[PDB]
């Protein structure tokens, strides 16, 4: 077993195989089978270019031969930081057949974050593009080497310059070592705050299972045309059901150069995408655009919004604005993924974050002392299942703090189970606002503010206060001409918003700092108000 990997228990694992959750097939097996089954069907679409499943299968084998020849071995970690391009697919599946382990970095990561990844994972290779969205990644690669000379295999999809051109790593296919579905297939990146970023070992079995249950819940099939709008390396646009869930269902993937409507809308009309995924901030952007920018988006059947809670005040609009069904997705790269069903009532789709996609997903809402909080009550979320990890990669410390003795992962979210099984997210524990004895949920205030005519978006965060411990500062994005702070505080007051919840402070900005996948980084906003405060 990979060093640093925590196995599932013998009983559970055995039960996961008996109940057919772990199908004993690898990603290499998946692509082989799909290529043999689907042959010339278009698997990936990027611009004016296309790649049939059979073509992917082949390019993957050739790329594997080249990698092996270059020196990459089974169990070797490779840092993969590519944009939404075709190469990404052939690269990971090639690594999959070599038993080599990818480390899914995002195109928004820089020297500090990549160096950590390569160091920590002891990467034997670094795969990047020559340039994307105006950023030169080879220059970033040089910065990495100076700070990490040991790193000797920088592969580049594009103009390699002094590096190793990924395109010449394609050669005559060879026999590769055995790859067990029980082996760790790759390392993901957690999505909390702070930055460190823990790595997440995911096996062929548990991840392929997540894909399967995702396809069934999101109704993917050969007719599915999924638009990859979010950086597809993130767990969400990658498997919930993501680009891979689409491969699994034999559907068709459309690669968008950017999450922007400017790039997405034309592609939705042209390639007739039936589904795509967004995060809250981006959904707002799209909803505005869907109004003052008329183009055919009618083929759209399912719009997914997740990564962070999509406040009901905005969620309610999706149906009217887009003419399709909204689907909230509340998943995590550590495992558990909740979806609103495409079936259930609008009320549910608009007011909940869904329920576990697997009958074998478990949940324990607890209080500050680890007591099964009273049904319906709010509390800390813990989950356990067929595709939720038992330990982060090489991290004894954080693992004690993150997993209970019974194997329950501490998601770090604060939620309340609906008396059926659905979850209604309140917000991350870290984003809770401890204001003078009170526990303030930011999203509640934000959802209210989203109902104001002059508000495009709103993100409330905490600021230090020697008296109350913490205070609240809400960052607002104007729908044009910034309203007066007092005007918003009045708005909330008239809505019946509890006094202690009203934002102590208000800040206007043209946008919010973001995480790699594109959600709002409340750790940055906190740092913003913090810094700004000590200015006086």
Swiss-Prot record:
GO terms for cellular component: cytoplasm. Substrate binds at residues 234-235, 240, 519. Pathway: Siderophore biosynthesis; bacillibactin biosynthesis. Keywords: ATP-binding, Cytoplasm, Ligase, Nucleotide-binding. One of its GO terms (biological process) is siderophore biosynthetic process. PROSITE patterns: AMP_BINDING (PS00455). Its main location: cytoplasm. Its EC number is 6.2.1.71. PANTHER family: LONG-CHAIN-FATTY-ACID--COA LIGASE, NONRIBOSOMAL PEPTIDE SYNTHASE PES1 (EUROFUNG)-RELATED. Belongs to the ATP-dependent AMP-binding enzyme family. This is 2,3-dihydroxybenzoate-AMP ligase. It comes from Bacillus subtilis (strain 168).
């Amino acid at each position: 077993m990979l060093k640093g990997f925590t196995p599932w228990p013998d009983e559970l694992a055995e039960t996961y195989r008996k109940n057919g959750c772990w199908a004993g097939e690898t990603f290499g097996d998946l692509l082989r089978d799909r290529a043999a089954k689907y042959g010339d069907r278009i698997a990936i679409t990027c611009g004016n270019t296309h790649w049939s499943y059979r073509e992917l299968d082949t390019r993957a084998d050739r790329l594997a031969a080249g990698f092996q020849k270059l020196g990459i071995q089974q169990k070797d970690r490779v840092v993969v930081q590519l944009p939404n391009i075709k190469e990404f697919f052939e690269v990971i599946f090639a690594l999959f057949r070599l038993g080599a382990l990818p480390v899914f970095a995002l195109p928004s990561h820089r020297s500090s974050e990549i160096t950590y990844f390569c160091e920590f994972a002891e990467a034997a290779a670094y795969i990047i593009p020559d340039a994307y969205s105006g950023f030169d990644y080879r220059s970033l690669a040089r910065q990495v080497q100076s700070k990490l000379p040991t790193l000797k295999n920088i592969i580049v999809a594009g103009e390699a310059e002094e590096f190793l051109p990924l395109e010449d790593l394609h050669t005559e296919p060879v026999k590769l070592p055995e790859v067990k579905s029980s082996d760790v297939a790759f390392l993901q990146l957690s999505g909390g705050s702070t930055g460190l970023s823990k790595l997440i070992p995911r096996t062929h079995d548990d991840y392929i299972y997540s894909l399967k249950r995702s396809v069934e819940v999101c109704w993917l099939d050969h007719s599915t045309v999924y638009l990859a709008a979010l950086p597809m390396a993130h767990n969400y646009p990658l498997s919930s059901p993501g680009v891979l869930g689409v491969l699994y269902a034999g559907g068709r993937v459309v690669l968008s150069p950017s999450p922007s409507p400017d790039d997405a809308f034309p592609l939705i009309e042209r390639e007739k995408v039936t589904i795509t995924a967004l995060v809250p901030p981006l959904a707002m952007v799209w909803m505005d655009a869907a109004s003052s920018r008329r183009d055919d988006l009618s083929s759209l059947q399912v719009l997914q919004v997740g990564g962070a809670k999509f406040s009901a005040e905005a969620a309610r609009r999706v149906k009217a604005v887009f003419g399709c069904t909204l689907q909230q997705v509340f998943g995590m790269a550590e495992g558990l993924v909740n979806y609103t069903r495409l079936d259930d009532p609008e009320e549910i789709i608009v007011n909940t974050q869904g329920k576990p996609m697997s009958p074998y997903d478990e949940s324990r809402v607890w209080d500050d002392h680890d007591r099964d909080v009273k049904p319906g009550e709010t509390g800390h979320l813990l989950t356990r299942g067929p595709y939720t990890i038992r330990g982060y990669y090489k991290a004894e410390e954080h693992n004690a703090a993150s997993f209970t003795e019974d194997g329950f992962y501490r998601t770090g979210d604060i939620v309340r189970l609906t008396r059926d099984g659905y979850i209604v997210v309140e917000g991350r524990a870290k984003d809770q606002i401890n204001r003078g004895g009170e526990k303030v949920a930011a999203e509640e205030v934000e959802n209210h503010l989203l109902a104001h005519p002059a508000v495009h978006d709103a993100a409330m965060v905490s600021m230090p206060d020697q008296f109350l411990g913490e205070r609240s500062c809400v960052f607002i994005i104007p729908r044009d001409e910034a309203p007066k702070a007092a005007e918003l505080k009045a708005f909330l007051r008239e809505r019946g918003l509890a006094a202690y919840k009203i934002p102590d402070r208000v800040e206007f900005v043209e946008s919010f700092p973001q995480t790699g996948v594109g959600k709002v980084s409340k750790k940055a906003l906190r740092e913003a108000i913090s810094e700004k405060l000590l200015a006086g």
